[PDB]
Amino acid sequence: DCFGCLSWSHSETHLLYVADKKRPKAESFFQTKAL
Amino acid sequence: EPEEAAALYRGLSRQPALSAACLGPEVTTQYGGRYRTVHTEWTQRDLERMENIRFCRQYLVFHDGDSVVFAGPAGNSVETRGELLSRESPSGTMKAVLRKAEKQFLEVWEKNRKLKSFNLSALEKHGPVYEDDCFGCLSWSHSETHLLYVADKKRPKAESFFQTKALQAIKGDQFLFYEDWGENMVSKSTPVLCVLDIESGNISVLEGVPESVSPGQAFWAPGDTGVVFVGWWHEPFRLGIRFCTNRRSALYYVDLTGGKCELLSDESVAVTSPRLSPDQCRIVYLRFPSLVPHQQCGQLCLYDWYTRVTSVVVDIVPRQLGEDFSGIYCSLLPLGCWSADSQRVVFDSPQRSRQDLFAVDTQMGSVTSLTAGGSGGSWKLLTIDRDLMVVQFSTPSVPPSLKVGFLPPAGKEQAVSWVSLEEAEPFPDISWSIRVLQPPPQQEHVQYAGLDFEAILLQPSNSPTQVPMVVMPHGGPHSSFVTAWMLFPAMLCKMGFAVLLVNYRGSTGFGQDSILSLPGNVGHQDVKDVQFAVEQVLQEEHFDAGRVALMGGSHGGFLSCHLIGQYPETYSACVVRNPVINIASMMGSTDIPDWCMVEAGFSYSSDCLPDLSVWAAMLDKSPIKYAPQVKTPLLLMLGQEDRRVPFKQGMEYYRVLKARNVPVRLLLYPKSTHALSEVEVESDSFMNAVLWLCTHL
Amino acid sequence: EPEEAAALYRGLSRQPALSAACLGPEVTTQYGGRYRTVHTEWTQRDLERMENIRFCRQYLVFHDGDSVVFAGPAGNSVETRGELLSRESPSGTMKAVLRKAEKQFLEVWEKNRKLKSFNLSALEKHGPVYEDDCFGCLSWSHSETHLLYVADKKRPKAESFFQTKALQAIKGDQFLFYEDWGENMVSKSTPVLCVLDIESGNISVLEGVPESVSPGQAFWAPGDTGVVFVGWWHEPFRLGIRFCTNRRSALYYVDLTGGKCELLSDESVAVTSPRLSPDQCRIVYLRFPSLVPHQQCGQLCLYDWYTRVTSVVVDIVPRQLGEDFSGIYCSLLPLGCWSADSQRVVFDSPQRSRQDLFAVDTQMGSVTSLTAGGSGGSWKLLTIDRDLMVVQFSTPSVPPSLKVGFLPPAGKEQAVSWVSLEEAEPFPDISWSIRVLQPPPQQEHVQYAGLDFEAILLQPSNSPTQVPMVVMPHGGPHSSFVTAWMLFPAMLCKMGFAVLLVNYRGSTGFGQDSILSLPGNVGHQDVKDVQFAVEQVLQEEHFDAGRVALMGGSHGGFLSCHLIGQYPETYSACVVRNPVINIASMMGSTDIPDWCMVEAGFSYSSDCLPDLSVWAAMLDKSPIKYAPQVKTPLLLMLGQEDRRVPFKQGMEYYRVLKARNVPVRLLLYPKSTHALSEVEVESDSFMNAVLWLCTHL
Amino acid sequence: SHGGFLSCHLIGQYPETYSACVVRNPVINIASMMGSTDIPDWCMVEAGFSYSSDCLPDLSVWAAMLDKSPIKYAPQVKTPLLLMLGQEDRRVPFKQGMEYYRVLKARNVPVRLLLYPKSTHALSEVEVESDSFMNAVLWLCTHL
Ligand SMILES: *S(=O)(=O)c1ccc(CCN)cc1
Ligand SMILES: *S(=O)(=O)c1ccc(CCN)cc1
Ligand SMILES: *S(=O)(=O)c1ccc(CCN)cc1
């Protein structure tokens, strides 16, 4: 109830909500890659 | 009482078993003595964790070049976990290990460090690695720079028609059918040969293998120029491969670079087990002339690498060659089988009711028995390197023991001296003997006349005096009983019974004529042989004729059902594991459809159709025909996931017997297989069988 | 570049480490020679599976009674899995193993068979078995009929108020609080002594232990009449036990039958590590006179079993006793430490900046150094049996190596000959030396005048010539750096840096006065010692003064923060792992509240209350006071599940620095601990630290 | 929480009035609560000072914070106490109650402690709430 929401458009064609920001992918220094 | 039986089972199962052995490099001391180490692998049941544990132990041998000066142990036992295949380098300085830890890893060990490790799953060049004895292998190069093994062919990626993509792969091919190789080979369709470079780490899949063959049992060619392997034909469809040596196959050689395969044998029969000489000049392998019987006497053949000439070293023995040889029946030669001079080959083979060690000179073609004479026993050869052999010896009253020896020079192999590395305490409460039985004139066929069979009798020593008897025929039907350490017969003998194991006509170790006599006569020839043996033993030894029981599995269950159907006033109990009841309906559900035709007396051909005459002949030889006359209490054990013998075969017999109000007990294991080799399953089945036998007798 | 750093890290971490060793029984050959086997355990990091693997290897030694004729290997390396504790029987014929397979099992091995196995979880007499070096133990009886170990006390069963019963246990007690022993001892509240009978299989928990003590480190009394153990007081509440030797404890003996415990020492100080003589006549142990410092010089004391007389064999050394001894600082004696004659005791101890082996005669009280002289090095004693010692040797430029030797007779211990069992290839690109530093007259205290400290300098050999430097102070603060094989300093030296490890005043191995000087002066004496060492090294060796970096952990992080706060124009980079920032707020969250009072200069007492003067004094000694003056880039690593140092301490510093726009990088490991000893965590932290250092320098 | 705070004060300044006490996640030491809570401004605001970022610890502020804590009256406590704590609480760290528990136990005072390893500040889980309420009612009825 602090940040969450879910709203309809006046034309009822789009929906609006709030999500979490995407984080860049990460990997370890010692990772085996496919040959 | 269940408590005493459980205590006896715990006591008897404590004995371990020997699986493999290898020899280390030679070391010379400053004083002048020379010694070398031996690594042995043992396996043992564990009822607390209900698992088969494996451990390793090391021994040390001081020798003077041609005699064993001293031998001893070199530490305690260490239990391993995860090892699938292992191999020591030719120089003995490096070791290659395949481990499951679930992913698969290939590790290289040297001294007290692990030099390199490769995660075969991450590279994604193939599937799971084969670890069985049919196709699996792991070989070092002569330069010790590359490794060769066999893996599963990679499958194209697949996806569903309705898959969400984020804001290549075939669609609708995730449920295609990939045929496997049958029993104990689930999800094993098409193997491929893989070569790994240790220094760099790149894995390469060899090209040039024919598109209609499965490769296996590969080793590096002389000079590291190519790879020699065995190709099994899998067209138009795959047949069963376990305990069957009548599958069409050939020997091929392929260059490392992209090139065409070269044929080295005849592409009409079955060949197997090729080994290369120490001097890298000749190869030896086993060839089987026909494809009708699943097991038969074989030929030992030699191939010269440079002159390209093939000769037959050891041929087929019809009945007997002398008094100690009857043919080659082993399906695999030892990994090391050549002598130091690259002239003689040492192996082990059944002989009547025992197992012996033989040495054959490839130059001339003579065969010499190394363990001739004596009361009996079972020998197994594990390895030989620089004329030093490691063997395991066991008798029905003695658990396996480990010995070493030196191979004498040519012409004096009969004077080999054995030194005991590990000895086991015998059981003096068991006495075993061998009986020879000659069939009556009525039960003889014109083609093969004069054949005789054998039985092994175990009884409690120092008996006070009427005792019960338990009769066991072997499966196969082309197999045999040998005078080795068997657990359940030992338990039955120690608990108070007398065990009679029958080797009827058609067994291995008695010649090719014995093998060829049985087919086409199942259901009336073996049944009579067992009945004659039982009657002769009862009339000779003067046992208690009122308490006789039967036990067998697979074809043994077939024979037991036939016996309790045709002679309903002789036996008082019966135990069967995965029996064969209806041959006609077994054709469409088993993985070896040719077995039914071969045993019924007809030739098997692909693209065949059901015929009334063939089906009537198959139905006339089934024990179900004698179902209404059954009067003996029966206990059945079935494995639901069995592919060799479908489990509905026993269900038909159970329903027929239950419809007539006959005492029948049934046990079904949902996740077990044909062998019932799981520790919990095996223990439960054995305890139930012994309780049934003691209660009804 | 990350690729070169990763390759270097792999190459350096490929080296293994030695953990334990034991000696087998003596064997006499027919020729006349005598030999025995040695079993060694090694551990090694594996980055493919990201795990610490453990394996075992066996060696063989031929001796003539007083000299080593020959030595060699006896096979390959075998990797084990699941072993927690193991012990060989006194006669050497049987082996006891504790395994986790998740339940816990106790197994007995003899020759090539596992005689017995016990599922300790099924009997339900206690909890999990202790396997640490603080309380864990596993002992054989003199008759080899019983086993003694330590387990967790059983808790009464509990259930909820609202539980459905089918148509005894306390209700509402499932969330009670059970206090544990602190860091690395999660869910370890109250241990108990357990005795197992091998023949029968019944487990018994001994009675008579005082209700306010925790028992540990137990062994059988002479004649198998009772059990001797060490009891740690846990009233009114438990304090931290890891790396702390100032915990009140005593030595007790209790009979097997129900009876009252007997006291054998003084119940006012800390005692530890009791060992019994081979002739079962006397005991030796370590005693610490005070409880204020967490680590200090100790006393070696002897107790006679029959005369019941206690004497002090080795006493406290204030500054120096000769030129090779400075006191006993090891917290544990070897499992086998007595000579064959039950007269001399062999151990290892730090000495200035090295680690040496010492032999002490209990009759007189003299101490002899076995590895005196030379350039330096680090020795560790693993075992001694029948005057045959097994040792591990390492230097900053040489990985650990394994050697054996024979103890000379009394009065000639300086002429011991070592025979190399396993040798490692050195790294010629590292050159190390030792510097001695004398503080200026201003930085001296009246009570202890004339003390000096040391540093270890590692540099790349054959340098062309301005190089950067990395300065490392140790934690503790009562610990030290020794000239042993360290991984990260070696990597930094090989990559191009010069490493300076400082042993400031207050370290172990320099006498009791050095230990006692530090407390009450933290924050202004240690910091200055490091600054003086850095300035002297820079002015002498003529390095690159523009590129100097700091690195440390725990108290090392404390010192690093103090250094970057008070001298903001000297260092250009800093790396800290779990630092201590605010002493005042650390009291209420750590498991050792007495540490803050002891270091701040006050006496610790239970049932104490916060006072303004004490809290002001604690706040005056914290690096946070110098936070506004920080100008150096900082990289922080924190473990969220750390109990020794709460992770909010670093968060306060991070917030303060970030509020002023200072370049700061922070890494948080959700499931790591104080040590950060996980393979993945350690590798990631080391790579991040090296990348930060190379980028900013 | 804060009410439990008050409760502790009520058993330190007036030790001859109440015969039982139950507290859930109380606040014991304001001075040491600053560095572990997620709302550091609360301590300054309640203690009478203005909160500003990039601040430093001062002797006067810390003394004022310590003078207002119930721990000062710990030696005078005479009432049986039952404590419930949630180990994964971020609003009020659970060591605050542990300090009070240790101080009271060092003087041989009847104290019962319950710790929920995976609970939070609210203790809103059904099992946790039911167990805590039943334990509280049993304690109250037994001691009254
Ligand atoms: S069963 O155990 O009698 C049986 C029959 C035939 C085969 C094929 C040959 N190995 C296997 C098992
Ligand atoms: S930290 O590594 O500086 C540190 C400080 C004090 C101790 C207690 C004594 N072992 C442990 C770690
Ligand atoms: S506790 O329940 O007393 C407590 C105190 C202060 C706050 C912050 C304002 N919501 C929350 C809970």
Coordinates of N, CA and C in Angstrom, one line a residue, chain C residues 539-657:
Chain C
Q539 N 62.0 5.0 3.3 CA 63.2 5.8 3.3 C 64.5 4.9 3.1
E540 N 64.4 3.6 3.4 CA 65.5 2.7 3.3 C 65.6 2.1 1.9
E541 N 64.5 1.4 1.5 CA 64.5 0.6 0.3 C 64.3 1.5 -1.0
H542 N 63.9 2.8 -0.8 CA 63.7 3.7 -1.9 C 62.7 3.2 -2.9
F543 N 61.5 2.9 -2.4 CA 60.4 2.5 -3.2 C 59.6 3.7 -3.8
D544 N 58.5 3.5 -4.4 CA 57.7 4.5 -5.0 C 56.7 5.0 -3.9
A545 N 57.0 6.2 -3.3 CA 56.2 6.7 -2.3 C 54.9 7.2 -2.7
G546 N 54.7 7.4 -4.1 CA 53.4 7.9 -4.6 C 52.3 6.8 -4.7
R547 N 52.7 5.6 -4.6 CA 51.7 4.4 -4.7 C 51.9 3.5 -3.6
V548 N 51.2 3.8 -2.5 CA 51.2 2.9 -1.3 C 49.8 2.6 -0.9
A549 N 49.5 1.3 -0.7 CA 48.1 0.9 -0.4 C 48.1 0.1 0.9
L550 N 46.9 0.0 1.5 CA 46.7 -0.7 2.8 C 45.7 -1.8 2.6
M551 N 45.9 -2.9 3.4 CA 44.9 -3.9 3.4 C 44.9 -4.6 4.8
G552 N 43.8 -5.0 5.3 CA 43.6 -5.6 6.5 C 42.2 -6.1 6.8
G553 N 42.0 -6.8 7.9 CA 40.7 -7.3 8.2 C 40.5 -7.3 9.7
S554 N 39.3 -7.1 10.1 CA 38.9 -7.1 11.5 C 39.7 -6.0 12.2
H555 N 40.6 -6.4 13.2 CA 41.4 -5.3 13.8 C 42.3 -4.7 12.8
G556 N 42.7 -5.5 11.8 CA 43.5 -4.9 10.7 C 42.7 -3.8 10.0
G557 N 41.4 -4.0 9.8 CA 40.5 -2.9 9.3 C 40.4 -1.7 10.2
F558 N 40.4 -2.0 11.5 CA 40.4 -0.9 12.5 C 41.7 -0.1 12.3
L559 N 42.8 -0.7 12.2 CA 44.1 0.0 12.0 C 44.1 0.7 10.7
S560 N 43.6 0.1 9.6 CA 43.6 0.7 8.3 C 42.8 2.0 8.3
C561 N 41.6 1.9 8.9 CA 40.7 3.1 9.0 C 41.4 4.2 9.8
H562 N 42.0 3.8 10.9 CA 42.7 4.8 11.7 C 43.9 5.5 10.9
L563 N 44.6 4.7 10.2 CA 45.7 5.2 9.3 C 45.2 6.1 8.2
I564 N 44.1 5.8 7.5 CA 43.6 6.6 6.5 C 42.9 7.8 7.1
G565 N 42.5 7.8 8.3 CA 41.9 9.0 9.0 C 42.9 10.0 9.5
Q566 N 44.0 9.5 10.2 CA 44.9 10.4 10.8 C 46.0 10.8 9.9
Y567 N 46.3 10.1 8.8 CA 47.3 10.4 7.8 C 46.7 10.4 6.4
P568 N 46.0 11.4 6.0 CA 45.2 11.3 4.8 C 46.0 11.6 3.5
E569 N 47.3 11.9 3.6 CA 48.1 12.2 2.5 C 49.2 11.3 2.2
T570 N 49.1 10.0 2.6 CA 50.1 9.0 2.5 C 49.6 7.8 1.6
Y571 N 48.4 7.3 1.8 CA 47.9 6.2 1.1 C 46.9 6.5 0.0
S572 N 46.9 5.7 -1.1 CA 46.1 6.0 -2.2 C 45.0 4.9 -2.4
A573 N 44.9 3.9 -1.6 CA 43.9 2.9 -1.7 C 43.8 2.1 -0.4
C574 N 42.7 1.5 -0.2 CA 42.4 0.8 1.1 C 41.4 -0.3 0.8
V575 N 41.6 -1.5 1.4 CA 40.7 -2.6 1.4 C 40.6 -3.2 2.8
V576 N 39.3 -3.3 3.2 CA 39.1 -3.8 4.6 C 38.0 -4.9 4.5
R577 N 38.1 -5.9 5.4 CA 37.2 -7.0 5.5 C 36.7 -7.1 6.9
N578 N 35.4 -6.8 7.1 CA 34.7 -6.9 8.4 C 35.5 -6.0 9.4
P579 N 35.6 -4.7 9.2 CA 36.3 -3.9 10.2 C 35.5 -3.6 11.4
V580 N 36.3 -3.1 12.4 CA 35.7 -2.6 13.7 C 35.7 -1.1 13.6
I581 N 34.6 -0.4 13.7 CA 34.4 1.0 13.5 C 34.1 1.7 14.8
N582 N 33.1 1.2 15.5 CA 32.6 1.9 16.8 C 32.7 0.8 17.9
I583 N 33.6 1.0 18.8 CA 33.7 0.1 20.0 C 32.5 0.2 20.9
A584 N 32.0 1.5 21.1 CA 30.9 1.7 22.1 C 29.7 0.9 21.7
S585 N 29.3 0.9 20.4 CA 28.1 0.2 19.9 C 28.4 -1.2 19.6
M586 N 29.6 -1.7 19.6 CA 29.9 -3.1 19.3 C 29.7 -3.9 20.6
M587 N 29.6 -3.3 21.8 CA 29.5 -4.1 23.0 C 28.2 -4.9 23.0
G588 N 27.1 -4.3 22.6 CA 25.8 -4.9 22.7 C 25.4 -5.9 21.6
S589 N 26.3 -6.1 20.6 CA 26.0 -7.0 19.5 C 27.0 -8.1 19.3
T590 N 28.1 -8.1 19.9 CA 29.2 -9.1 19.7 C 29.0 -10.2 20.8
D591 N 29.7 -11.3 20.5 CA 29.6 -12.5 21.4 C 30.8 -12.5 22.4
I592 N 31.6 -11.5 22.4 CA 32.7 -11.3 23.3 C 32.7 -9.9 23.9
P593 N 31.7 -9.6 24.8 CA 31.7 -8.2 25.3 C 32.9 -7.8 26.1
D594 N 33.6 -8.8 26.7 CA 34.8 -8.5 27.5 C 36.0 -7.9 26.7
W595 N 36.0 -8.2 25.4 CA 37.1 -7.7 24.5 C 37.1 -6.2 24.5
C596 N 36.0 -5.5 24.4 CA 35.9 -4.1 24.3 C 36.4 -3.4 25.6
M597 N 36.0 -4.0 26.8 CA 36.5 -3.4 28.0 C 37.9 -3.7 28.2
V598 N 38.4 -4.9 27.9 CA 39.8 -5.2 28.0 C 40.7 -4.3 27.2
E599 N 40.3 -4.1 25.9 CA 41.1 -3.3 25.0 C 41.0 -1.8 25.4
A600 N 39.9 -1.3 25.9 CA 39.7 0.1 26.2 C 40.4 0.4 27.5
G601 N 40.8 -0.5 28.3 CA 41.6 -0.3 29.5 C 40.8 -0.5 30.8
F602 N 39.6 -1.2 30.8 CA 38.8 -1.4 32.0 C 38.7 -2.9 32.2
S603 N 38.3 -3.2 33.5 CA 38.1 -4.6 33.9 C 36.7 -5.0 33.6
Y604 N 36.5 -6.2 33.0 CA 35.2 -6.7 32.7 C 34.6 -7.5 33.8
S605 N 33.3 -7.2 34.2 CA 32.6 -7.9 35.2 C 31.2 -8.1 34.7
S606 N 30.6 -9.3 35.0 CA 29.2 -9.5 34.7 C 28.3 -8.7 35.6
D607 N 27.1 -8.5 35.1 CA 26.1 -7.7 35.7 C 26.6 -6.2 35.9
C608 N 27.2 -5.7 34.8 CA 27.7 -4.4 34.8 C 26.7 -3.5 34.1
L609 N 26.9 -2.2 34.3 CA 26.0 -1.2 33.8 C 26.7 -0.1 33.0
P610 N 26.1 0.5 32.0 CA 26.8 1.5 31.2 C 27.1 2.8 32.0
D611 N 28.3 3.2 31.9 CA 28.8 4.4 32.6 C 29.2 5.4 31.6
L612 N 29.1 6.7 31.9 CA 29.4 7.8 30.9 C 30.9 7.8 30.6
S613 N 31.7 7.6 31.7 CA 33.2 7.7 31.5 C 33.7 6.6 30.6
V614 N 33.2 5.4 30.8 CA 33.6 4.2 30.0 C 33.2 4.4 28.6
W615 N 32.0 4.8 28.4 CA 31.5 5.0 27.0 C 32.2 6.1 26.3
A616 N 32.5 7.2 27.0 CA 33.3 8.3 26.4 C 34.7 7.8 26.0
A617 N 35.3 7.0 26.9 CA 36.6 6.5 26.6 C 36.6 5.5 25.4
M618 N 35.6 4.7 25.3 CA 35.4 3.8 24.1 C 35.2 4.6 22.9
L619 N 34.4 5.7 22.9 CA 34.2 6.5 21.7 C 35.4 7.3 21.3
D620 N 36.3 7.7 22.3 CA 37.5 8.4 21.9 C 38.5 7.6 21.1
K621 N 38.4 6.3 21.2 CA 39.4 5.4 20.5 C 38.9 4.8 19.2
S622 N 37.8 5.4 18.7 CA 37.3 4.7 17.5 C 37.7 5.5 16.2
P623 N 37.9 4.8 15.1 CA 38.3 5.5 13.9 C 37.2 6.4 13.3
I624 N 35.9 6.2 13.7 CA 34.8 7.0 13.2 C 35.0 8.5 13.5
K625 N 35.7 8.8 14.6 CA 36.0 10.2 15.0 C 36.8 10.9 13.8
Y626 N 37.6 10.2 13.1 CA 38.4 10.8 12.0 C 37.7 10.6 10.6
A627 N 36.4 10.2 10.6 CA 35.7 10.0 9.3 C 35.7 11.3 8.5
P628 N 35.4 12.5 9.0 CA 35.3 13.6 8.0 C 36.6 13.9 7.3
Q629 N 37.8 13.5 7.8 CA 39.1 13.8 7.1 C 39.5 12.7 6.1
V630 N 38.7 11.7 5.9 CA 39.0 10.6 4.9 C 39.0 11.1 3.5
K631 N 40.1 10.8 2.7 CA 40.2 11.2 1.4 C 40.6 10.1 0.4
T632 N 40.8 8.9 0.9 CA 41.3 7.7 0.1 C 40.1 6.9 -0.4
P633 N 40.1 6.4 -1.6 CA 39.1 5.5 -2.1 C 39.1 4.2 -1.2
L634 N 37.9 3.7 -1.0 CA 37.7 2.6 -0.1 C 36.8 1.5 -0.7
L635 N 37.2 0.3 -0.4 CA 36.4 -0.9 -0.8 C 36.2 -1.8 0.4
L636 N 34.9 -2.1 0.6 CA 34.5 -2.8 1.8 C 33.9 -4.1 1.5
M637 N 34.2 -5.2 2.2 CA 33.6 -6.5 2.1 C 32.9 -6.8 3.4
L638 N 31.7 -7.2 3.4 CA 31.0 -7.6 4.7 C 30.3 -8.9 4.5
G639 N 30.2 -9.6 5.6 CA 29.5 -10.8 5.8 C 28.2 -10.7 6.6
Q640 N 27.0 -10.9 6.1 CA 25.8 -10.6 6.8 C 25.6 -11.4 8.0
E641 N 26.0 -12.7 8.0 CA 25.8 -13.6 9.1 C 27.0 -13.7 10.0
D642 N 27.7 -12.6 10.2 CA 28.9 -12.5 11.1 C 28.4 -12.3 12.5
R643 N 28.9 -13.1 13.5 CA 28.5 -12.9 14.9 C 29.7 -12.3 15.7
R644 N 30.9 -12.5 15.2 CA 32.1 -11.9 15.9 C 32.1 -10.4 15.8
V645 N 31.9 -9.9 14.6 CA 31.8 -8.4 14.4 C 30.5 -8.2 13.6
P646 N 29.5 -7.5 14.2 CA 28.3 -7.2 13.5 C 28.5 -6.3 12.2
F647 N 27.8 -6.6 11.2 CA 28.0 -6.0 9.9 C 27.5 -4.6 9.8
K648 N 26.8 -4.1 10.8 CA 26.4 -2.7 10.8 C 27.5 -1.7 11.1
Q649 N 28.6 -2.2 11.6 CA 29.8 -1.4 11.9 C 30.3 -0.8 10.6
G650 N 30.5 -1.6 9.6 CA 30.9 -1.1 8.3 C 29.9 -0.3 7.6
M651 N 28.6 -0.5 7.9 CA 27.5 0.2 7.3 C 27.5 1.7 7.8
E652 N 27.8 1.9 9.1 CA 27.9 3.2 9.6 C 29.0 4.0 8.9
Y653 N 30.2 3.4 8.8 CA 31.3 4.1 8.1 C 30.9 4.4 6.6
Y654 N 30.3 3.4 6.0 CA 29.9 3.6 4.6 C 28.9 4.7 4.4
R655 N 27.9 4.8 5.3 CA 26.9 5.9 5.2 C 27.6 7.3 5.5
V656 N 28.5 7.3 6.5 CA 29.2 8.6 6.8 C 30.1 9.0 5.6
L657 N 30.8 8.1 5.0 CA 31.6 8.4 3.8 C 30.8 8.8 2.6

